[PDB]
Amino acid sequence: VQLQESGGGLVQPGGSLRLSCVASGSVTFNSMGWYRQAPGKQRELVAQITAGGDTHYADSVKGRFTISEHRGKNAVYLEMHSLKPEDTAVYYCHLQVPFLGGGYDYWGQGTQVTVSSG
Amino acid sequence: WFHAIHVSGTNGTKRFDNPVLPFNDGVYFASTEKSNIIRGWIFGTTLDS
Ligand SMILES: *[C@@H]1O[C@H](CO)[C@@H](O)[C@H](O)[C@H]1NC(C)=O
């Protein structure tokens, strides 16, 4: 249970949503990341933010996506831009809480953000 | 106390120490290591099919 995740909403193409993997308290991790998953498709990586500051981006996401951590509120911020309908998916927040040397991400509690003109 | 690779011989013995311990009302497991040799646990009653 522990970590609780929420945020985001339905938008239209061309808009921008500043979604956040809002946590519930101060947490420890080494590489925070966000996923997506559409029905009939597997989960695909979107972005990666580590404790050091490395920012990994997938092929379809450079030039439009920014990641910022707010250690004051202990939450990363997941801000999309130039949104297109292909981005509609079951968004996940995989965590890097250490577990036997790292693992057991909390992506199961996801958010529902749909990009469509109607 | 369980030392993982028990070295009984002075030159060196290379056998593991993983006895099938009981699980009564929960356990407290603490591990001290430096190269991630502890990889998990298996739980059950008879540990068979
Ligand atoms: C959350 O709840 C609000 C108010 O009930 C609702 O307008 C919204 O559609 C719900 N879902 C999301 C993703 O915000």
Residue A9 CA, closest ligand 1 atom number: 13
- Which chain A residue has the Cα nearest residue B37? A100
CA distances from A13 to A73, A81, B7, B16 (A): 30, 10, 65, 59
DSSP string, chain A: ----------B-TT---EEE---SS----SEEEEEE--TTS--EEEEEEESS--EEE-TTTTTT-EEEEETTTTEEEEE--S--GGG-EEEB------SSSS----TTS-EEE-B---
Do β-strands A89-91 and A111-113 pair in parallel, antiparallel, or remain unpaired? antiparallel
Nearest 5°: the CA angle A60, A63, A65 is 80
> In the numeric block, which tokens belong to residue A104?
């057991």
Kind of pairing, strands A55-57 and A66-70? unpaired
- Ligand 1: residues whose CB is within 6 Å? A 8-9, 112
Distance CA A103, CA A115 (A): 31
DSSP B12: -
Of A94, A113, A89, A103, which Cα lies nearest the Cα of A21? A94
**CA dist list (Å): B24 to A32, B20, B43, B47, B48:** 37, 13, 12, 16, 19
Residues of A in contact with B31 (CB under 8 A): none
Taking contacts as CB-CB distances below 8 angstroms, the residues of chain B near A100 are: 36, 38-40
Place of tokens 């298996």: B42
Strand pairing category for B5-6 and A111-113: unpaired
In angstroms, what CA-CA distances link B4 with A6, B13, B23, B29?
A: 43, 12, 20, 14
Supply φ then ψ for residue A86, to 5 degrees: -65, -20
**Does residue B36 sit at the A interface (CB-CB below 8 Å)?**
yes
Sequence-distant (6+) residues with CB within 8 A of B41 are B29
Q: Please state, in angstroms and rounded to a whole number, the distance separating the CA atoms of residues A23 and B13.
A: 48
The two structure tokens encoding residue A110: 């996801």
C-alpha closest to that of A92 among A105, A79, A80: A105
The count of C-alpha atoms lying within 13 angstroms of the C-alpha of A77, restricted to the half-sphere facing its C-beta, is: 11
CA A101 – CA B22 distance, rounded (Å) = 25
> Residue A21 C-alpha to ligand 1 middle, in angstroms?
16
Nearest atom within ligand 1 for CA of residue A111: 13
Tokens 């099938």 — which residue? B20
